[PDB]
Amino acid sequence: KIEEGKLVIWINGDKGYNGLAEVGKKFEKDTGIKVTVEHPDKLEEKFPQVAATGDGPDIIFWAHDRFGGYAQSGLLAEITPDKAFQDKLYPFTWDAVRYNGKLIAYPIAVEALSLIYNKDLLPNPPKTWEEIPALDKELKAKGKSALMFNLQEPYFTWPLIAADGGYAFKYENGKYDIKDVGVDNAGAKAGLTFLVDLIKNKHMNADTDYSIAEAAFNKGETAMTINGPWAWSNIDTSKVNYGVTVLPTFKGQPSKPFVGVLSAGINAASPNKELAKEFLENYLLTDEGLEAVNKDKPLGAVALKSYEEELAKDPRIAATMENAQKGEIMPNIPQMSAFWYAVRTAVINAASGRQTVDEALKDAQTNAAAHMDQSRALRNAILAWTPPQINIMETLPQPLPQILSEGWLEVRADPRGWLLIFTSDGAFATGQSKLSEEFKKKRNIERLGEALAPWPGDLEVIGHTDNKPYRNTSNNSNLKLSEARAQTVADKLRESLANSKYNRTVTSVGKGDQEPLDDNATEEGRRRNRRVDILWKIGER
Numbered sequence: 001k002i003e004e005g006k007l008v009i010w011i012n013g014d015k016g017y018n019g020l021a022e023v024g025k026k027f028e029k030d031t032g033i034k035v036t037v038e039h040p041d042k043l044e045e046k047f048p049q050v051a052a053t054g055d056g057p058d059i060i061f062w063a064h065d066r067f068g069g070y071a072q073s074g075l076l077a078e079i080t081p082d083k084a085f086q087d088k089l090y091p092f093t094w095d096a097v098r099y100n101g102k103l104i105a106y107p108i109a110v111e112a113l114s115l116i117y118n119k120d121l122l123p124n125p126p127k128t129w130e131e132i133p134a135l136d137k138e139l140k141a142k143g144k145s146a147l148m149f150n151l152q153e154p155y156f157t158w159p160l161i162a163a164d165g166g167y168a169f170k171y172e173n174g175k176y177d178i179k180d181v182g183v184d185n186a187g188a189k190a191g192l193t194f195l196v197d198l199i200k201n202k203h204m205n206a207d208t209d210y211s212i213a214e215a216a217f218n219k220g221e222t223a224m225t226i227n228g229p230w231a232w233s234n235i236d237t238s239k240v241n242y243g244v245t246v247l248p249t250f251k252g253q254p255s256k257p258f259v260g261v262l263s264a265g266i267n268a269a270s271p272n273k274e275l276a277k278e279f280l281e282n283y284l285l286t287d288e289g290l291e292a293v294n295k296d297k298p299l300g301a302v303a304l305k306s307y308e309e310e311l312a313k314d315p316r317i318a319a320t321m322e323n324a325q326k327g328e329i330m331p332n333i334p335q336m337s338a339f340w341y342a343v344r345t346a347v348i349n350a351a352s353g354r355q356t357v358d359e360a361l362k363d364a365q366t367n368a369a370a371h372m373d374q375s376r377a378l379r380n381a382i383l384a385w386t387p388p389q390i391n392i393m394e395t396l397p398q399p400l401p402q403i404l405s406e407g408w409l410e411v412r413a414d415p416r417g418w419l420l421i422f423t424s425d426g427a428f429a430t431g432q433s434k435l436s437e438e439f440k441k442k443r444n445i446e447r448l449g450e451a452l453a454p455w456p457g458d459l460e461v462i463g464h465t466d467n468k469p470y471r472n473t474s475n476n477s478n479l480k481l482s483e484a485r486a487q488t489v490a491d492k493l494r495e496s497l498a499n500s501k502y503n504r505t506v507t508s509v510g511k512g513d514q515e516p517l518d519d520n521a522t523e524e525g526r527r528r529n530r531r532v533d534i535l536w537k538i539g540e541r
Contacts, residue, residue: 004272006034008036009060010059012039012062013041015293016293018296019296019297021035023288038057044062047070051075052075060267061264063263064260064330065331065336067105067332076265090107092324096261106265108262108290113156114227114228114257116242118241120220128248128250128252129163132248144221146222148204148212148224149208150226151195151199151207151347154347155340156226158343160250160255161188161195161343167181168336176333181339183342183368190250192350255327260330285304287307287310290302290304291310335375338372342364342365342367392538398451400451409448414536422531423532427532433481433488445489445492448493448496453502455538457502457504459493459505460534461507461508463484464515464517465478465513465529475512479511516529517529
């Protein structure tokens with residue numbers, strides 16, 4: 001449960017969380033509201049788990065791409081920056097934080113690939129891709145090469161492939177059209193053909209990967225590479241006299257790198273939405289706020305126009321923002337993993353000679369569509385070991401009806417399958433979260449687990465307590481007791497499901513007195529409220 005009257009902020013470990021804490025300190029001094037900054041490990045996978053519960057931090061800082069799933073799961077609150085505030089930030093940054101037409105985060109920082117070049121080899125680096133062949137010929141005669149960059153990962157070759165017309169998902173009217181992917185079009189083929197031709201003419205090696213390119217550039221053996229701000233410190237350390245500039249154009253058009261936008265989102269379950277809004281809009285997203293975070297750890301380019309003008313005195317920061325404005329926001333939808341796989345396969349196959357460019361992109365298109373269809377199926381349906389020519393959505397399979405007859409467990413149908421319920425009286429000694437001695441001797445929970453094991457379907461364990469007559473507030477001791485009881489039951493189920501053909505997900509959640517089943521004004525009613533729910537999700541009914 002989130003603590004009203006204060007703010008808990010999650011930001012990743014590689015950011016300037018100490019400077020974020022300073023901004024929190026000034027927030028406290030000015031308003032008395034204390035701000036706590038944390039960097040939990042894997043916070044991007046923690047947040048969707050705890051916020052679904054209603055727990056978590058009030059503010060989460062992460063790259064914008066994951067916020068799409070959170071927004072889909074309803075974990076983020078819509079934000080309401082006014083017109084004057086939105087004009088303070090670069091317009092394109094607001095597109096990175098829109099889900100179904102609703103603003104759902106504040107853009108902080110901006111990141112994209114750039115052209116990195118050796119100033120001693122190349123004081124005036126080429127403006128166009130097309131002029132790189134002749135440049136490599138000249139540099140080959142010196143014992144050098146023009147350009148080496150990671151050809152294994154489509155993140156790095158996509159800027160050229162998109163330049164003349166390739167795209168991932170058509171972005172029209174603030175939404176991504178997963179039916180309109182632009183891998184198999186002429187622009188994509190023209191770019192991928194140019195890339196393949198550089199390899200056939202020996203200007204590049206098809207095996208070149210991230211490590212090979214970095215070593216060659218940082219050793220002064222190639223005049224240019226393509227990388228992100230995360231690579232600059234290794235170049236600094238190699239002391240190669242280097243610069244950072246706009247990516248070359250292709251057929252007169254900008255290379256279009258994908259843009260990652262560090263964003264700040266507000267938890268939908270937060271009871272401090274007004275405090276969060278005020279911290280972000282009036283303290284963090286300001287020259288002073290951003291500068292404080294940036295001194296701790298560089299943000300790179302930033303969405304806030306006024307501070308970006310200050311950071312852009314470094315020509316490398318200016319180039320990052322320039323490439324980002326010419327690029328495309330990374331789509332925040334799950335179908336991107338079909339796009340990435342399909343394109344990755346296409347490029348290594350065209351570059352290796354295994355396929356022509358047109359066959360490889362033709363296959364990428366049909367592969368991606370098939371992949372997206374199959375991913376949806378595993379979301380919306382269950383692929384299960386089925387009896388051949390009993391419907392467990394209408395008839396509980398044996399031995400469940402027997403277990404339900406033993407006087408301790410009940411069931412009712414649920415919109416997502418079956419809700420099993422058992423009162424916690426008797427399952428646990430008074431005030432106890434360890435399972436009663438009686439339940440252990442009878443193997444109540446483990447036989448229930450063994451009864452579910454031959455069948456698919458995830459489980460959700462939810463503990464509830466009664467509450468005291470006429471109190472409209474929640475008891476925090478009752479909350480933790482229900483959470484501990486739920487965890488005991490879920491662990492015991494997991495253990496007894498070890499022999500299942502399924503590795504189902506089993507979550508546990510304490511609801512305390514928040515979700516009563518009946519009236520707490522009588523013991524008749526309080527009894528009903530002291531219970532454990534097991535939601536068995538075998539499909540929608």
